[PDB]
Write a protein that holds these residues in place. Structure first.
Motif, PDB file in Angstrom:
ATOM      1  N   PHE A 127      36.584  39.086  53.104  1.00  0.00           N
ATOM      2  CA  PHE A 127      35.424  39.714  53.725  1.00  0.00           C
ATOM      3  C   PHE A 127      34.282  39.678  52.724  1.00  0.00           C
ATOM      4  O   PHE A 127      34.475  39.998  51.539  1.00  0.00           O
ATOM      5  N   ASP A 128      33.105  39.284  53.185  1.00  0.00           N
ATOM      6  CA  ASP A 128      31.927  39.253  52.317  1.00  0.00           C
ATOM      7  C   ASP A 128      30.920  40.266  52.852  1.00  0.00           C
ATOM      8  O   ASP A 128      30.180  39.969  53.793  1.00  0.00           O
ATOM      9  N   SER A 129      30.901  41.477  52.276  1.00  0.00           N
ATOM     10  CA  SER A 129      29.864  42.452  52.617  1.00  0.00           C
ATOM     11  C   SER A 129      28.518  42.113  51.971  1.00  0.00           C
ATOM     12  O   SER A 129      27.479  42.682  52.356  1.00  0.00           O
TER      13      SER A 129
ATOM     14  N   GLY B 169      39.685  25.722  47.972  1.00  0.00           N
ATOM     15  CA  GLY B 169      39.050  26.384  49.113  1.00  0.00           C
ATOM     16  C   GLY B 169      38.479  27.731  48.710  1.00  0.00           C
ATOM     17  O   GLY B 169      39.134  28.506  48.000  1.00  0.00           O
ATOM     18  N   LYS B 170      37.252  28.005  49.148  1.00  0.00           N
ATOM     19  CA  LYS B 170      36.664  29.328  48.943  1.00  0.00           C
ATOM     20  C   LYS B 170      37.414  30.344  49.788  1.00  0.00           C
ATOM     21  O   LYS B 170      37.607  30.133  50.996  1.00  0.00           O
ATOM     22  N   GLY B 171      37.843  31.446  49.152  1.00  0.00           N
ATOM     23  CA  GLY B 171      38.693  32.411  49.833  1.00  0.00           C
ATOM     24  C   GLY B 171      38.204  33.844  49.756  1.00  0.00           C
ATOM     25  O   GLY B 171      38.881  34.683  49.154  1.00  0.00           O
TER      26      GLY B 171
ATOM     27  N   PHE C  63      35.109  35.263  58.263  1.00  0.00           N
ATOM     28  CA  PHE C  63      35.244  33.809  58.210  1.00  0.00           C
ATOM     29  C   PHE C  63      34.905  33.227  56.826  1.00  0.00           C
ATOM     30  O   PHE C  63      34.897  32.004  56.663  1.00  0.00           O
ATOM     31  N   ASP C  64      34.630  34.062  55.822  1.00  0.00           N
ATOM     32  CA  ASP C  64      34.247  33.542  54.517  1.00  0.00           C
ATOM     33  C   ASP C  64      35.436  33.009  53.714  1.00  0.00           C
ATOM     34  O   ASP C  64      35.246  32.609  52.561  1.00  0.00           O
ATOM     35  N   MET C  65      36.650  32.998  54.282  1.00  0.00           N
ATOM     36  CA  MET C  65      37.814  32.309  53.718  1.00  0.00           C
ATOM     37  C   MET C  65      38.177  31.052  54.509  1.00  0.00           C
ATOM     38  O   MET C  65      39.300  30.544  54.385  1.00  0.00           O
TER      39      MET C  65
ATOM     40  N   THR D  24      24.587  39.642  44.164  1.00  0.00           N
ATOM     41  CA  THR D  24      26.041  39.759  44.340  1.00  0.00           C
ATOM     42  C   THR D  24      26.549  39.079  45.602  1.00  0.00           C
ATOM     43  O   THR D  24      27.780  38.945  45.761  1.00  0.00           O
ATOM     44  N   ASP D  25      25.652  38.686  46.510  1.00  0.00           N
ATOM     45  CA  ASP D  25      26.024  37.979  47.732  1.00  0.00           C
ATOM     46  C   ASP D  25      26.123  36.469  47.538  1.00  0.00           C
ATOM     47  O   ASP D  25      26.492  35.760  48.483  1.00  0.00           O
ATOM     48  N   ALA D  26      25.805  35.967  46.351  1.00  0.00           N
ATOM     49  CA  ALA D  26      26.128  34.590  45.969  1.00  0.00           C
ATOM     50  C   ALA D  26      27.479  34.550  45.265  1.00  0.00           C
ATOM     51  O   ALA D  26      27.642  33.995  44.166  1.00  0.00           O
ATOM     52  N   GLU D  27      28.474  35.179  45.899  1.00  0.00           N
ATOM     53  CA  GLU D  27      29.738  35.411  45.214  1.00  0.00           C
ATOM     54  C   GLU D  27      30.650  34.195  45.258  1.00  0.00           C
ATOM     55  O   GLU D  27      31.509  34.053  44.383  1.00  0.00           O
ATOM     56  N   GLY D  28      30.499  33.327  46.269  1.00  0.00           N
ATOM     57  CA  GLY D  28      31.422  32.207  46.408  1.00  0.00           C
ATOM     58  C   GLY D  28      31.375  31.262  45.223  1.00  0.00           C
ATOM     59  O   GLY D  28      32.418  30.816  44.737  1.00  0.00           O
TER      60      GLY D  28
HETATM   61 ZN    ZN Z   1      29.927  34.702  50.782  1.00  0.00          ZN
END
Ligand code: ZN
Ligand code: X10
Ligand code: X10
Ligand code: X10
Ligand code: NA
Ligand code: NA
Ligand code: ZN
Ligand code: ZN
Ligand code: ZN
Ligand code: ZN
Ligand code: ZN
Lengths: 519, 525, 522
Positions: A294-296, A289-291, A314-316, A374-378
Motif C-alpha cells: 500500500f502506498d499512502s 519487481g516493485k513491491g 496496486f503498487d505491488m 516520501t511518495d517517491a518511495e518505489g
Molecule cells: Zn508508490
C-alpha cells in the motif's frame, strides 16, 4: 513463513489464492478446418472478417458437416449481417439429427491483421456470449488469419477475461455463474497451433495469479502475507527461496529500502526466488519487481485531487508480475538459464516511526540520498534491490514497477515504457513485447537531467529540483545503482490497472516469460 | 469503568460534567395573568406583539397591580416603542412600596403565531437582558398566545441559552456572571401550563448534557471516557447498562466498526443502555447514535480547504443526542416501552495501525465491504450498530448521525433530514419534530443509485462510484444492514453545530424523547 | 424572425430541427395477451421476471403460433438464461415458413412492481437490440404487470432512446433500420390503446426539447432559439410574441438585461400562448430558464468540476417549456389558457458584461446587489416572474437548471420542487407521479432570508454564508412573486444524462401532465 501481525483478531492473516481455477478444468480440442466443422452441443462461434470492405457482409467459408446448418449459413442468409469489429449474433436451428444447436459469429472487421487491441475486443464480445448462458461447450471457428503468437494470445485473453474473481464475495456471489467444460477450436493447419494451447493455459494462470495478488486489498496483501504467498508458490514449483527479514536487511545495510518501511506495522520482507535449469547454465537473469503493498505517500500523503489513494493496493503490481513469471518459468522449465525473482516488499505509511521528507538515508552501496518526497518511495526500494541483484553476478537485470504517474501522460494506459543502459537488452525486451503481445515502447534516459539530482548535502537527491519528466528522472536515479551490468527498467504505472473493467491486467507476466524463454 | 489511556500524565482521564447547574437552582412559579402582575423586585419583561401592524406600537394588555408601574406603562408613554421581533427596551422606576424595579418588553412582531425560529429570536433578546446585569429575579408576562409545546420550548430555550459552559475556563472565568434565583411567569390559563415547567427543565438538561459531551474536546471526550460517562449516567438513572469492549466486539464479528477504530490509541467501546417500563411492554425501540469522538478522516485525511478538521470533536453528536434522550426518558419514566440506547464509539485516526482506502472488511452480518474512502467511516460503524440493533428484536430502529456534509447543501443549518424504509415511522418522526420544535424534513432513498454501490470484488462498496448525493447514498448503504425492521435515519451533520454562537445545539434530544413519549402513550391518550 | 449575427460567414444562422422522425412512421398495434402471440414476423421480445427466485431462470408462458419458435421457447432452453434486470439474449431462427425471425427476452428482475428507473433499464436493453436490428417489426410481449401510466412511459422512453440525433454528423447507420411496425401483447390491451398516441406526442415533445438542448451554443443562441420558438408557434397555431431589447428596456427588466450585456446576441424574451376554444377557467404561466450559454461571466467557470463545456444545457428549462408547448398545442386541452415564457440570453465575458458587485434594478423596482455573475439564472427569472405575474394567472410554475447544489441533495434522478402554495406543490407532485418524471418537495426555509439582506441594495442576489443554495435561490425568486400561487422546479441535477452524453428533455411530460390533468374535469 512468518506470522502476519494483526490489530484486531478479524484482520486477515493470508491472501486467499485460487490455484485450481475453472479454466483448468476446460478440455481443449483443436481440429483442422479442412475436415469440416461438426455443429452439436453448446455454442459454435465463427470468427469472420471482410478485408477491404468496411462493415462488409458476413460469409461463412468453412465446410460444415450438417446439411441443416449449412443451409442456415448460406451466403444469402448471412449477407444481412456485417463484420463490424466486436459485433455478434446468435443463431438457433435444428441439426441433421433433429437436435437444436446454437451458432453465431463475432465480427473481426476489415483489417486482415488484427492488433492485440482488436483481438481483445473480439474476445470481449465472445465472453459476453459466454456470460448469462449456461453452456457446456464453446466451439470457435477461425475464419481469420492469426499467427501462432496471436492464436496463443486469443486463448490467454479468453481464459483471463472469462475467469471471475469471487474470493472476496460472501453474500453476493453470482448464483448463475457456470463455466464451460469443453472448448473446441477449428483452424487451418491445426497441428501447428496445438503446441500453443498448454502454453496459453500456463500464461493465463501466471497472469491471473498476478491479478489475484494485485486485486487483494492491502489488509489481506501486506509485506508478510505477500512474501508468505511467494514461499508457498516456490514450494509448489520446487523453486529455491529466501525471504530476508529486517535483521538480515540491516546487516546488508539496505537503508533506502528499510527507511520506506519504517512507518509500517508490517516488517519489511525481501523476496528472492531462484529457478535453475538442470543443465549447464548459459545465461543468468535477475527480475526485480516493485513491491509496495500500500502506498499512502507517507508524510507526503496522497491528498491531492486525483492522487487515487484508494487504488494504491496496486503498487505491488511489479512484484506480482515477477511472481507470475516465476509461476510460468517454474512450470515450463526452460533450459540453460538461471533466473532470480526479486522484490523488496514493504508498505509506505504515516506514523511516528515513518521516515520524513528531508531525511538523508544510506543505500547498501554506500550512496547517501536526500529524500525530497516520501511518495517517491518505489525508486528507494528498487535502489537497494538493484544493488542486491548486481551482487548476484547476472548477465541481465530487468526491473518492472508501477513507478511514475507521468506514464499516463506519456504513453497512457495501453503501452508500458522501457528504459535502460544497454541497447541489446532493450531490443530483447521489445522483441518479447512483440511475441507476448504486451506492448512496450522504448523511452530515453536523458543524461542532461542528471545534474538536477545533485544534492547540496547528500551524494544524490531522490527527486529532481526542476524536471517534471519524472519517469526519466526516476530512471536516471535507478541507473546510479547498477554499475557494470546490462539493465532495463519497465515502468508499468499506466498499464497495470484496467480502469474501465475495475480490475488488474496482470501486465508483464507474459512479457517477462517470453523474455526468459526467448533467451 | 475502564481506564483511560494517556500519552503524558497531563492527558485528562474523564469528561468534566456538570449535573447540578445554576438553572436547576431557579425557583419557577406560574401565575394566571387574570389576577394581575405584581412588580416587586428584579426585572419584569412583557412579551408583546401587535397583530397585523408591522413594527406597530407597544401596548401593554395586562393588569399591573402597582399604580406607579401602571402609570409608566400607559400607551402614551409606550408609543415611541415598537414590536419589531427581537427588539427590547429597559425601564427604571419606583413602585408603590418605594422600591426601585426594572421593567421592559421584548417585541414579538406582528404575526400572531411564532415559529420556532421566531421564538428563539425572542429568547435570545431576553437573554441579552439577563447578561451583564446582576439580577436576582426575572418575571415574564406573556401577552402573546402560545400553545403548551411552544411555552415549553420557550423555557427550554431560555434555560439552554442562559447557561454558560465554563468547564474549560481556568484563568478567564467570567467574574461578573450571576444567575437569577427566581423565575416568575404570568400567562393565561396558567394551570394548564404548570406541568410544562418541570418537563422543560428535564428537556433542558438532556439537551445541555448532550451539548457538554459534544463541546468536550477529543482529548477529554474519547471512546473510553465517553462510555465511562454513559455508565455513570445509567447508574444515576437506574438504567441497565452494558459496555462491549474489543474482545466481545471481535466475537460478534463487528469488522466494519472495529476497522474504523484500528488506528486509535483508544479501544473501541460500544454503549448499550436500556430503559424498561414496569408492566406490559408494548413497543421496543432502538436508538442508535453515531459516536466518532474525533474524525481526522483517516488516511483520507481532512486536508482539503473547508473540511473543518478543527470541529470534528462534534462527530459524536449523534451518540450525545441518544444519551441526552436516555437522561430524559430515564427521568420521565414512560410506560409501556423498552428503549435501547446504542452507540458504536471509536476515533478515526492516522497510524501505522489504521485501516486503509481499498481494504475489504467484513460486517457482522457477513457482508464484505470495499472501503473507498476512510473518511466515510460513520456509515461503517453504524452498519454494525444496526445489525446489533435488529438482533434485539425491536419494533423500530432510529439512528441519528452527523453523517454527510452534503446536508449543508440540501437543508442547511436549520432542518435535519430524515430517511427511512417505513412511512409510518417517518411520519412518527415528523410528528415528533412538530411537538419538540426541532425541525426535520423527509428526504428520499432513491433506489436508482443503489447500483453505484456495486463492487467488483466485495459484496458492496462503502461509497458511490458516480453519485454526489452522498446523504442519499449513505442511506442506501445503511439500508443494507436492516433486513426486516422499520428503520429511520436522521442526518444531523448540518444542524448539530451553531456556527454563529460557536457551540453545540444538542440537536435531537427533544426530538427523540418526544418520539419515545408519543409512542408510550396510546393515541386515544 | 430576427437576423442572427455572425462573426464569420461560417457561423450558423439557425438551429437544425427534425420534426418528421422515423418514430412517426411506426405503426403501433396493441393485442390482448390472453389470446396468444403471433410471432411469424420480425423480432419478438418477451419481458420476463421471476419473483421468488432472485436472478432466477427465464420461463416463457405465452402460447405462440409457430412450431419452431415454440420449441425455442421450451422451459429446458430458456432456463439457460436468467432474469437479472436488463439482461437479454436474442436468437435468429427460421419460422415454420422458412422466413427469418428473431426471438429473445429482457430480464425484469424479481420484484413484480417496476419503478420508472427499472423500466428505463429494460428499455435500454431493448434499444441495444434495436440498434443492431434490420427486421421491420418488433413485438414486445408483456409477461409482467405494468399500469397504464407506466406502459405509456415504456413507449415514450422506447421512442426517445431509439431515436438518434444525427443533425451535426456529416455522414449516415449501416447496422440497423428503423422498424415500421411495433406490436405489443399486454393484459387488458383495450384500456392501454389510448396511451399509444399520447406517448407519441410526449415522445416528440421530449425529443424536441432534447434537440434544442443538445444544439451547441453557436447554433442555439438567443436569436436562433427565439426564431425556433416562433416557427413552432406558427406550426401549432399558437399566438406568439418575441420581445426585443427596446421593449425590454421599456419594461425596465434591468436584471435580465444586465446578464445579457456581455453577449453579441441581443436578448430575446419568448412569450407563446395557447388559449382553449371554450371558456377559460384556469390561466397558467410556465417560465423556463433560457441561458443559451453560461460561461459564468466575470465569475468565470474555471474551478475544477465547473463543467463549462456542457453549459449549452443551461437553457434546458426553456426547452422543457417549448416541448410542453408542442404537447399542449397538439393535444389541445380544454378550458385553459397557457403562457409559455422564457427570458432568453447568453452569459459572456466582454468589456460590456455586468460585473460582480454591480447594483441593478429589476422591473418591479427592487434593486439587487450582484454577488456573483454566475448566479445569473435567478436574475433572468426575477424579471420573467414579474412579467408572468402581471399576466394575472392562477399558477406560475418555473423550471430551471438553477443550482449545482441539486447534485448534492437529490442527485441526477429526482428534481426538486419549491413553492409558496401547498396545493400547487401537491399538483406538481401528482404530475410527477403520472408523468413518471420524479420530483421531490424541498422547503423554503424562511430563517435563511436574512442572509439576502444587502447593505446597499434592496436585496442580495446570493448569500455570503448559507450553503443551502437551492433554498436561498428559492427565497430570492419568491421576492418577485407577490400574490400568486407559484412553484419552482430546479432541474440542474436531472437535466443532462452524463452516462449517455445526451439531454433527457426532463420536464416536458411533467408540465404537460400538470396542464392536462391544474384543472379537475369530472
Ligand atoms: Zn508508490
Ligand atoms: O508519479 C507520481 C507523482 N507525479 C504524478 C502523479 C500522478 C499523475 C501524474 C504525475 N507519484 C507516483 C507514486 O506515488 N510512486 O510511488 C504515482 C502516482 C500515480 C500513479 C498512477 C497509477 C495509475 F494507474 C493511474 F491511473 C494514475 F493516474 C496514476 C502511479 C505512481
Ligand atoms: O460528507 C462528507 C463528504 N464531504 C463533504 C462534502 C460536501 C460538504 C461537506 C463535506 N464527509 C463527512 C465525514 O467525514 N463523515 O465522517 C462529513 C463532512 C463534513 C460534515 C460537516 C458538519 C458540519 F457541521 C458542517 F457545518 C459541515 F460543513 C460539514 C459532516 C460529515
Ligand atoms: O449553483 C451554482 C453554485 N456552484 C455550485 C454549488 C454547489 C455545487 C456545485 C456548484 N452554480 C450554478 C450556476 O452557475 N448557474 O448559472 C450551476 C452549476 C452547475 C450546474 C450543473 C448542471 C448540470 F446539468 C449538471 F449535470 C451538473 F452536474 C451541474 C448547474 C448550475
Ligand atoms: Na494487492
Ligand atoms: Na442547446
Ligand atoms: Zn509513491
Ligand atoms: Zn469522516
Ligand atoms: Zn465522521
Ligand atoms: Zn451561472
Ligand atoms: Zn446558469
Amino acid at each position: 513463513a512468518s506470522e502476519v501481525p494483526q490489530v484486531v483478531s478479524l484482520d486477515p492473516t493470508s491472501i486467499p489464492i485460487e490455484y485450481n481455477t475453472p479454466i483448468h478444468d476446460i478440455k481443449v480440442q483443436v481440429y483442422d478446418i479442412k475436415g469440416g466443422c461438426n455443429v452439436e452441443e453448446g455454442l459454435t462461434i465463427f470468427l469472420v472478417n471482410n478485408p477491404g470492405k468496411e462493415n462488409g457482409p458476413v460469409k461463412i467459408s468453412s465446410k460444415v458437416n450438417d446439411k441443416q446448418v449449412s443451409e442456415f449459413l448460406k451466403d444469402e442468409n448471412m449477407e444481412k449481417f456485417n463484420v463490424k469489429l466486436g459485433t455478434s449474433k446468435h443463431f438457433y436451428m435444428f441439426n441433421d439429427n433433429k437436435n437444436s444447436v446454437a451458432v453465431g459469429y463475432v465480427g473481426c472487421g476489415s483489417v486482415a491483421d488484427l492488433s492485440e487491441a482488436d483481438m481483445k475486443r473480439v474476445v470481449l464480445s465472445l465472453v459476453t456470449m459466454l456470460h448469462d448462458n449456461k453452456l457446456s461447450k464453446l466451439t470457435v471457428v477461425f475464419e481469420i488469419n492469426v499467427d501462432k503468437n496471436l492464436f496463443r494470445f486469443f486463448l490467454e485473453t479468453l481464459f483471463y477475461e472469462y475467469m471471475t474473481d469471487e474470493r472476496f464475495k460472501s453474500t453476493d456471489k453470482n448464483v448463475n455463474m457456470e463455466y464451460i467444460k469443453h472448448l473446441g477450436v477449428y483452424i487451418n493447419n491445426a497441428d501447428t497451433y496445438k503446441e500453443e494451447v498448454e502454453k496459453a493455459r500456463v500464461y493465463y494462470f501466471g497472469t491471473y495469479y498476478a491479478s489475484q495478488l494485485i486485486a487483494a486489498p492491502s489488509n489481506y496483501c501486506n509485506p508478510v502475507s505477500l512474501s508468505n504467498a511467494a514461499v508457498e508458490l516456490a514450494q509448489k514449483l520446487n523453486l529455491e527461496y529466501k525471504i530476508l527479514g529486517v535483521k538480515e536487511l540491516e546487516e546488508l545495510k539496505m537503508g533506502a529500502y528499510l527507511s520506506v518501511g519504517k512507518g509500517s506495522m508490517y516488517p519489511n520482507k525481501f523476496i528472492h526466488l531462484t529457478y535453475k535449469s538442470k543443465g549447464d547454465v548459459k545465461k543468468k537473469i535477475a527480475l526485480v519487481g516493485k513491491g509496495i503493498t500500500f502506498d499512502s505517500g507517507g508524510y507526503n500523503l496522497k491528498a491531492a485531487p486525483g492522487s487515487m489513494i484508494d487504488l494504491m493496493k496496486f503498487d505491488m503490481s511489479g512484484c506480482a508480475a515477477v511472481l507470475g513469471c516465476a509461476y510460468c518459468v517454474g512450470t515450463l522449465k526452460p533450459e540453460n538459464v538461471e533466473i532470480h525473482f526479486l522484490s523488496a516488499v514493504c508498505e509506505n505509511m504515516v506514523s511516528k516511526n515513518s521516515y520524513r521528507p528531508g531525511d538523508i538515508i544510506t543505500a547498501s552501496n554506500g550512496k547517501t540520498i536526500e529524500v525530497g518526497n516520501t511518495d517517491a518511495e518505489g525508486r528507494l526500494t528498487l535502489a537497494d534491490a538493484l544493488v542486491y541483484a548486481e551482487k548476484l553476478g547476472v548477465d541481465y537485470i530487468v526491473d518492472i514497477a508501477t513507478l511514475t504517474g507521468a506514464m499516463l501522460y506519456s504513453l497512457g494506459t495501453s503501452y508500458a515504457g522501457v528504459f535502460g543502459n544497454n541497447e541489446e537488452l532493450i531490443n530483447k525486451i521489445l522483441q518479447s513485447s512483440k511475441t507476448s503481445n504486451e506492448p512496450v515502447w522504448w523511452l530515453p534516459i536523458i543524461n542532461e537531467y542528471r545534474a538536477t539530482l545533485n544534492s547540496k548535502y547528500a551524494d544524490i537527491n531522490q527527486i529532481s529540483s526542476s524536471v517534471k519528466a519524472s519517469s526519466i528522472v526516476a530512471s536516471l536515479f535507478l541507473k546510479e545503482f547498477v554499475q557494470n551490468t546490462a539493465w532495463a527498467h519497465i515502468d508499468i504505472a499506466g498499464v497495470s490497472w484496467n480502469f474501465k473493467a475495475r480490475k488488474p491486467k496482470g501486465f508483464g507476466v507474459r512479457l517477462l516469460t517470453e523474455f526468459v524463454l526467448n533467451d
